[PDB]
Structure 1
Amino acid sequence: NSVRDAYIAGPHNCVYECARNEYCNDLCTKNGAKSGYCQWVGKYGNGCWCIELPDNVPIRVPGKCH
């Protein structure tokens, strides 16, 4: 695919923790996503979740945040 809903990831395979939904919406959309929100409960715990994040931007995948 070219887009996917998931935890956006930063260097290196680390989710972006969050305190507000807007923080995530901003982070997600400035990276090409349709929108985003803060996930306080999810597959990887607290972290920003993006809707339709372009695939040239990293998402959290199995492994450790390093």
Structure 2
Amino acid sequence: KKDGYPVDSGNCKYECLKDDYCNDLCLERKADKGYCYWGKVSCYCYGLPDNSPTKTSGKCNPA
């Protein structure tokens, strides 16, 4: 398990508007708990899957 920014298949960091949205969406990804790191960033979870796809080197692009 590990914490980090859960990015979709194309590296789409699940952005957020409130800490609660990140916590919930965080629990769905399989994280125990997670808040919302604004600072032009995204949601932050804690407990995501080991190999969970997280920010690597992309900008979220439909393809």
The alignment's TM-score, normalised by the length of structure 1, stands at 0.77
Q: Distance in 1 between matches of 2:32 and 2:19?
A: 14
Q: Distance in 2 between matches of 1:62 and 1:52?
A: 21
Identity of aligned pairs, percent? 46
The alignment's TM-score, normalised by the length of structure 2, stands at 0.80
> How many residues in Structure 1 have an aligned counterpart in Structure 2?
61
Provide the aligned C-alpha RMSD in A. 1.4
Which blocks of at least 5 consecutive residues in structure 2 are unaligned?
none
Which blocks of at least 5 consecutive residues in structure 1 are unaligned?
none
- Higher relative strand content: 1
Q: Secondary structure of the residue that 1:52 maps to in structure 2?
A: strand
- State the match for 1:10 in structure 2: 8
The partner residue of 2:22 within 21, 24, 27 is 24
The partner residue of 1:40 within 38, 48, 54 is 38
The partner residue of 1:49 within 39, 44, 47 is 44
